[PDB]
Amino acid sequence: AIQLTQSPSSLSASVGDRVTITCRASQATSSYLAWYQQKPGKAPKLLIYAASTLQSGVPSRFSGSGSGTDFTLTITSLQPEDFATYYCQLSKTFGPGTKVEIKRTVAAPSVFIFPPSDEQLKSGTASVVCLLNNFYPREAKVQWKVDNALQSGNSQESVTEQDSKDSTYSLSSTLTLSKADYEKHKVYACEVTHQGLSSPVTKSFNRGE
Amino acid sequence: QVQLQQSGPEVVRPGVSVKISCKGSGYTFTDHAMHWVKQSHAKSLEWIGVFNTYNGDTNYNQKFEDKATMTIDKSSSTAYLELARLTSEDSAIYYCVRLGLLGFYALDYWGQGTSVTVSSAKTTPPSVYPLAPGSAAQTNSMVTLGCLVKGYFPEPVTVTWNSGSLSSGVHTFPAVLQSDLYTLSSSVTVPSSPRPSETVTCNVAHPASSTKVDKKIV
Amino acid sequence: QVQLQQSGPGLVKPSQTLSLTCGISGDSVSSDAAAWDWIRQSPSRGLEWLGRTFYRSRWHHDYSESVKNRITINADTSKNQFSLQLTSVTPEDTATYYCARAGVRVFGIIVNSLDYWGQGTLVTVSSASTKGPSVFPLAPSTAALGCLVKDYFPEPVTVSWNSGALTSGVHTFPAVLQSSGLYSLSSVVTVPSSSLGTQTYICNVNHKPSNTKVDKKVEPKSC
Amino acid sequence: DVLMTQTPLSLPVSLGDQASISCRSSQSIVHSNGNTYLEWYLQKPGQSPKLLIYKVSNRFSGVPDRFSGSGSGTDFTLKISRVEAEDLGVYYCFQGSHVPLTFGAGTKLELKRADAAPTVSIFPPSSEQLTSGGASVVCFLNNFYPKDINVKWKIDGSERQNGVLNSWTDQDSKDSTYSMSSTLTLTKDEYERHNSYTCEATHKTSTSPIVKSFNRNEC
């Protein structure tokens, strides 16, 4: 019966930049709420409780204050390890949470290509994977040319989580094809365009070479 | 400014429910919980239960689990106490208390408190009786004069002497209970030389029965 | 300090009772200075509190109206643990379940500030069956090498390089659903050029539901 | 439940001295998270008890520097550096660390003075009471010290216990003394049956108990 909103839903700040995160509650108490920091793949960790008291252990740069229907979380400076999704709770219901990233310079991606393994060929299928690593921003156009022909609708791409050391992402695209299709073509190239690249980069290989 | 206002005194029959209202002011009600502590003479300051004023989960003391329940009307910022099947010994003073700074403190501010007495008897006007030194009690310069009260209910009674003119040496006593009716007396110290123009007259005023009596002493 | 450990089945076919076990270390379940919550997180819905239990004179319970009449949080002071059982499981109850200990509890009023969350396990609702995965190497021509796992169910899997000897420069990817109803992911590590001639690389993959432990050595192709 | 006893029950202290009040816990009240939640409440006569000192080491706001607490484990003490006129009342030791939050029993603080002999005065039941139906004889002990005193009901050389009622008063503002009232209730048959109505009292001032006696035939 209580609705909590998180303002903003998502944001991105540079290193050492003060960021304020505000979550609003219809029924204010300033005594039963707390803020949780959650990193992906890990349990949420408590940050501050009672909206003003800082938990021990966590660095003092996480300060929260405010009263009335509004409550804010203040971070004095951001670090690459501080990327998380911050959740504010009101003793019964957790807010939608805010995705917080970390901004830095534009990073040039590294591209790698792996033909399917011999054991996979024995299985009768083929799975070609292109590794696209350590870049910034996340957006990156991935293209595949097989015998100077584009392919689409048969490949899947997965995006990892941003590294907490150097603040870069990584991508991989996988195409599942039968052995007949693999043996029907000789050249296979991985072409990717990124704003960190002045010119497009492609890596072409020949099967059996 | 923090202040708790509470209801007045009640007198009820045994086995009937009574209501106690505690209204708070000067602070946002939803922030701080409310306690309830009972004060009596057989027991001293036993704890009744707490009301977490935000959500509503109650933590009653195990002894008062059945005979007491607590309710909150957040609209008027008031805390309520409900009691059932009141016994004769239940006559006590019930305090409502704000809990402050969860983590520190325990109990910040206490209301003026309401005293609920049960008894069985109906309201009865007091009977004022005189006490005077005897015909062989004039052997000292100072003697003790006083009047006493029987068969009244309920408390209290204010006694004056010459309509309060003689406020020195007047001594009253706390009420006592026997045969379901309360009892108290009073006494003063006066010189044993009563002048013809000097008289002592003690007046008993009782607002429960709206009856005032003056008793002829000397 | 207080460390929480969990155990239970990650696969539950629909429409019966599932159960999780959350073991307590460093504290007593019947302590009067804490309370135990059960919080589950779903990517579509978010986070929500399911139920709570504590101890004053007898075992108490408290549940959220979302999952009322199908949840029972039974404590157990004998082995110092408490467990959740969910009845009549719908396919909308798939999520990751966290067991967590309430914080300040003094003065007989509980303040919800959870601070000792357990590792968290995920529960999925499906009538399918778990099966073992397959591993294929991806040795490149200087570049970065790694091993990929394909057609595995259900989550999760753990990928280690030389039994945890190498932990920098290794990337693990989130699981991706495929058309047939399976999941896959991959691992990649960067290397020096001269390392491939001397250093030995054997990556490890573990899948607890299928009790599979596969260790594969990745080397440049001979021919 | 935790059971506490405040030792001692009453504190006869003089103005501007040090008085110690001790509160002991049957079981350790160290809350598992930390700290030792203890509170002291003083209750001035005819008022509502306030908060004196919380978290026994700490001290609440608005209270002077004299009050201070000490101790850990199962023993706690509260010491008053100097006693003023306002310090009179009852002091309650309290804990919140183990639901239910029990309470103390109370410790009265009051002044001291030289022991004063009580003036005893016996009055017969009034002539109006003769036609009423009941009988009520009573003697007071006025302006004495301390509360420790006894009243005896010896009629015609015989001893009885029933029919006694007791009532003490708080210390007077000026003399800082006490008062006594022992009223004995009987019916008409026993009233006319007996001759000598006497009440005795034992106190420190009089080594021999004071006996005030009168007979019916002289009144």
Numbering used by the authors:
A (entry chain L): 1 to 91, 96 to 213
B (entry chain A): 1 to 52, 52A, 53 to 82, 82A, 82B, 82C, 83 to 100, 100A, ...
C (entry chain H): 1 to 35, 35A, 35B, 36 to 52, 52A, 52B, 53 to 82, 82A, ...
D (entry chain B): 1 to 27, 27A, 27B, 27C, 27D, 27E, 28 to 214
Quote the original article:
The VH6-1 class of antibodies includes some of the broadest and most potent antibodies that neutralize influenza A virus. Here, we elicit and isolate anti-idiotype antibodies against germline versions of VH6-1 antibodies, use these to sort human leukocytes, and isolate a new VH6-1-class member, antibody L5A7, which potently neutralized diverse group 1 and group 2 influenza A strains. While its heavy chain derived from the canonical IGHV6-1 heavy chain gene used by the class, L5A7 utilized a light chain gene, IGKV1-9, which had not been previously observed in other VH6-1-class antibodies. Antibodies of this class show characteristic immunoglobulin sequence features, such as the use of the IGHV6-1 gene and the presence of an “FG” motif in the third heavy chain-complementary determining region (CDR H3).
